[PDB]
Structure 1
Amino acid sequence: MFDVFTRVVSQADARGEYLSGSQLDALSATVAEGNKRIDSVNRITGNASAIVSNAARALFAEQPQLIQPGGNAYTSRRMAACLRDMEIILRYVTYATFTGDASVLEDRCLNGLRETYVALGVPGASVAAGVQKMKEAALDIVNDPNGITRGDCSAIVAEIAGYFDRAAAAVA
């Protein structure tokens, strides 16, 4: 995988160039955001079980066909598989947030996932709906101003939103 730093390095080596002064300044800006990034990862992780379960409950309330007999989330194992998939996706979103690069999410979670769901008959559009619900819960948690040093986390929130959107688009 790449992190935010190695992504820039990889591009530089391909051109055979030292990182320009601006590229170094950009990473210095990235470093300055570091605490907010760490806090955001910590906050999503600390609420992972709630995020998944609340999103799942809401998805099934809004899409009852999924849990009716014959529905794709019906039966304990299929329900379990579905909750597992949401937790996996959430986990990889936090990985990409941590590293500051989407490659870990793309290579190790989303690669081939649409093909798997098509083959299995998993409704990809419903998966994307679940991820959106997790996204919305997660971003509220990150932005909660209570119990933290106040500051602007909009940039980090926007990055995380993109990772969630990346996952939802891959499966739907």
Structure 2
Amino acid sequence: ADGNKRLDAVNSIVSNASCMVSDAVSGMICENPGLISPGGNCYTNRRMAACLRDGEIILRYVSYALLAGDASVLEDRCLNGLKETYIALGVPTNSSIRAVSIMKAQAVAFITNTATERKMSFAAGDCTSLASEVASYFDRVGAAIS
């Protein structure tokens, strides 16, 4: 029944949720520049826009899971059959895991207030119970696309 720490933890995500998707897809390209290549899957704005939308979807789907405090809604209208529509659309299954892990590493940095670019203003304490719970939620969504 962790009230205030949960509400402080979701606030550190949904406010700076606009950096996190654009940083993650640039990091997704940063390893693999053959994705923006002619013939790649991150070609022109038909596909790049759907990538930003899809990176945003799985980001938010986790903040409501954290607000509710459980992974039920992450499997109800989120995930039951997300792998086969991705292999039907022909997305690369490798770099999507990398994009998911950039979100993990950024969310665990935002929750523990260890960001080098922005120091957040919190009450004094330690959010170690919630920094691992979002890691468990992100692995739940990383175990699906595999």
| CA distance, structure 1, for counterparts of residue 78 and residue 94 of structure 2 | 17
Q: In the alignment, which residue of structure 1 is the partner of 2:43?
A: 74
Q: Paired residue for 1:162, among 130, 136, 142?
A: 136
Q: Paired residue for 1:129, among 90, 98, 122?
A: 98
Percentage identity across paired residues of the two chains: 57
Q: Bigger radius of gyration, 1 or 2? A: 1
Gaps of 5+ in 2: 115-119
1:89-100 correspondence runs (5 A):
89-100=58-69
Deviation digits for residues 60-99 of structure 1, max 9, x if unmatched? 1111121111111111111111111110000101111110
Give the TM-score, by structure 1 length. Answer: 0.78
| CA distance, structure 2, for counterparts of residue 166 and residue 47 of structure 1 | 22
| CA distance, structure 2, for counterparts of residue 158 and residue 34 of structure 1 | 17
Q: Report which of the two has the higher share of helix.
A: 1
Report runs of 4+ in structure 1 exceeding 3 Å deviation.
Answer: none
- Does residue 1:114 correspond to 2:114, yes or no? no
Q: In the alignment, which residue of structure 1 is the partner of 2:124?
A: 150
| CA distance, structure 2, for counterparts of residue 170 and residue 84 of structure 1 | 18
| Matched position secondary structure for 1:140 | helix
- Does residue 1:59 correspond to 2:28, yes or no? yes
Q: How many residues in Structure 1 have an aligned counterpart in Structure 2?
A: 141
| Matched position secondary structure for 1:98 | helix
Cα contact 1:129–1:168 (8 A) shared by 2: no
| CA distance, structure 2, for counterparts of residue 144 and residue 151 of structure 1 | 11
Gaps of 5+ in 1: 1-30
Shift of 1:117: 0.4
